[PDB]
Design an enzyme around this catalytic site. Structure first.
Site, PDB file in Angstrom:
ATOM      1  N   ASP A   1      54.076  46.244  -3.798  1.00 60.09           N
ATOM      2  CA  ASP A   1      53.314  47.446  -3.491  1.00 60.09           C
ATOM      3  C   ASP A   1      52.625  47.955  -4.752  1.00 60.09           C
ATOM      4  O   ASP A   1      53.282  48.212  -5.768  1.00 60.09           O
ATOM      5  CB  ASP A   1      54.228  48.540  -2.954  1.00 60.09           C
ATOM      6  CG  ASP A   1      54.770  48.246  -1.560  1.00 60.09           C
ATOM      7  OD1 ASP A   1      54.413  47.228  -0.932  1.00 60.09           O
ATOM      8  OD2 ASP A   1      55.588  49.078  -1.099  1.00 60.09           O
TER       9      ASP A   1
ATOM     10  N   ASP B   1      53.546  50.796  13.049  1.00 60.75           N
ATOM     11  CA  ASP B   1      54.408  51.742  12.345  1.00 60.75           C
ATOM     12  C   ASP B   1      54.942  52.739  13.374  1.00 60.75           C
ATOM     13  O   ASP B   1      54.191  53.572  13.889  1.00 60.75           O
ATOM     14  CB  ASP B   1      53.601  52.497  11.285  1.00 60.75           C
ATOM     15  CG  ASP B   1      53.212  51.628  10.109  1.00 60.75           C
ATOM     16  OD1 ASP B   1      53.329  50.382  10.184  1.00 60.75           O
ATOM     17  OD2 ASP B   1      52.785  52.208   9.087  1.00 60.75           O
TER      18      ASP B   1
HETATM   19  O1  LIG Z   1      52.563  47.510   3.968  1.00 59.66           O
HETATM   20  C1  LIG Z   1      51.774  48.395   4.324  1.00 59.66           C
HETATM   21  O2  LIG Z   1      50.713  48.130   4.908  1.00 59.66           O
HETATM   22  C2  LIG Z   1      52.101  49.863   3.976  1.00 59.66           C
HETATM   23  C3  LIG Z   1      51.156  50.851   4.268  1.00 59.66           C
HETATM   24  C4  LIG Z   1      51.403  52.174   3.943  1.00 59.66           C
HETATM   25  C5  LIG Z   1      52.600  52.518   3.320  1.00 59.66           C
HETATM   26  C6  LIG Z   1      53.559  51.544   3.014  1.00 59.66           C
HETATM   27  C7  LIG Z   1      53.301  50.214   3.334  1.00 59.66           C
HETATM   28  N1  LIG Z   1      54.214  49.293   3.083  1.00 59.66           N
HETATM   29  C8  LIG Z   1      55.113  49.196   1.930  1.00 59.66           C
HETATM   30  C9  LIG Z   1      55.927  47.929   2.272  1.00 59.66           C
HETATM   31  O3  LIG Z   1      55.376  46.745   1.607  1.00 59.66           O
HETATM   32  C10 LIG Z   1      57.468  48.026   2.106  1.00 59.66           C
HETATM   33  O4  LIG Z   1      57.854  47.675   0.773  1.00 59.66           O
HETATM   34  C11 LIG Z   1      58.076  47.015   3.073  1.00 59.66           C
HETATM   35  O5  LIG Z   1      58.003  47.555   4.384  1.00 59.66           O
HETATM   36  C12 LIG Z   1      59.509  46.659   2.704  1.00 59.66           C
HETATM   37  O6  LIG Z   1      60.480  47.627   3.170  1.00 59.66           O
HETATM   38  P1  LIG Z   1      61.725  47.859   2.245  1.00 59.66           P
HETATM   39  O7  LIG Z   1      62.414  46.447   2.129  1.00 59.66           O
HETATM   40  O8  LIG Z   1      61.295  48.414   0.949  1.00 59.66           O
HETATM   41  O9  LIG Z   1      62.735  48.794   3.044  1.00 59.66           O
HETATM   42 NA    NA Z   2      54.142  48.250  10.429  1.00 53.93          NA
END
Ligand SMILES: O=C(O)c1ccccc1NC[C@@H](O)[C@H](O)[C@H](O)COP(=O)(O)O
Ligand code: NA
Ligand SMILES: [Cl-]
Ligand code: NA
Ligand code: NA
Length: 234
Positions: A10, A120
């Site tokens: 990210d 989402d």
């Molecule tokens: O991935 C996206 O498109 C997005 C968009 C808006 C805000 C956050 C987003 N995603 C961040 C995303 O890459 C998270 O790190 C993953 O969903 C992994 O989840 P985690 O393993 O951190 O619980």
């Molecule tokens: Na999603």
């Protein structure tokens, strides 16, 4: 086939956010080195509409050998043009794109497998609504939209419970099952993996349509290494 793991990078302000910051190139290269099948690369700034990191994201893609899924603020012609123009294997069209339902249908026909649609999800009084991370408003009912996109030929879905994302509190296995039971399009799970056991739990659903699982925080928390996670799912 074994569950696919997509390490998440990210990007915010041109650095990878893990609150610690560092090189996004290096983070992604390190994951590829540890044997990543894919990288999930995210422009957080673009997702919140606050900024942009395209040029940096284009570097990252150009430097990797592995499959890259691009994500973040992919919502319109311009944003989709710049994403595809990185040469990434796949782009992840955000929930916010559903504000224009025909755009979504149109780009699904045009780009096919190159496009995934991000779902989402927020449970609101039991009801599965769509509320894009980084977006300011509600984006509709999950099932009504999932059905519409499935009949429009959506090739794959990225399914997040916005309440488990980044929390290390476990995934939403009900949501993962519910979505996959309702479509033959591959489902990628995102959010809330805390352990290797969660991966294994997700892996039980591979058979009804969950091909992959995106993992961010549990990798930077050192809860497990990548080869460990790769072993466990095989
Ligand atoms: O991935 C996206 O498109 C997005 C968009 C808006 C805000 C956050 C987003 N995603 C961040 C995303 O890459 C998270 O790190 C993953 O969903 C992994 O989840 P985690 O393993 O951190 O619980
Ligand atoms: Na999603
Ligand atoms: Cl996006
Ligand atoms: Na969350
Ligand atoms: Na996760």
């Amino acid at each position: 086939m074994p569950l696919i793991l997509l390490p998440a990078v990210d990007v915010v302000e041109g650095r990878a956010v893990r609150t610690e910051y560092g090189s996004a190139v290096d983070a992604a290269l390190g994951w590829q080195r540890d044997g990543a099948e894919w990288i999930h690369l995210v422009d957080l700034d673009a997702a919140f509409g606050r900024g942009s990191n395209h040029e940096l994201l284009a570097e990252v893609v150009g430097k990797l050998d592995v499959q890259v899924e691009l994500s973040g603020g992919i919502r319109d012609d311009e944003s989709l043009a710049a994403a595809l123009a990185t040469g990434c294997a796949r782009v992840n069209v955000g929930t916010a794109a559903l504000e224009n339902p025909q755009w979504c249908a149109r780009v699904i026909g045009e780009h096919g497998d190159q496009v995934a649609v991000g779902l989402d999800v927020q449970i609101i009084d039991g009801e599965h609504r769509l509320r894009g991370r980084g977006w300011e408003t509600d984006g509709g009912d999950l099932w009504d939209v999932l059905e519409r996109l499935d009949s429009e030929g959506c090739s794959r879905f990225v399914v997040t419970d916005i309440t488990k994302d980044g929390t290390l509190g476990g995934p939403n296995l009900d949501l993962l099952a519910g979505v996959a039971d309702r479509t033959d399009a591959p489902v990628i799970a995102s959010g809330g993996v805390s352990s290797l056991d969660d991966l294994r739990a997700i892996a039980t659903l591979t058979h009804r349509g969950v091909e992959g699982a995106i993992v961010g925080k549990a990798l930077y928390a050192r809860r497990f290494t990548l080869p460990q996670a790769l072993a466990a799912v095989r």
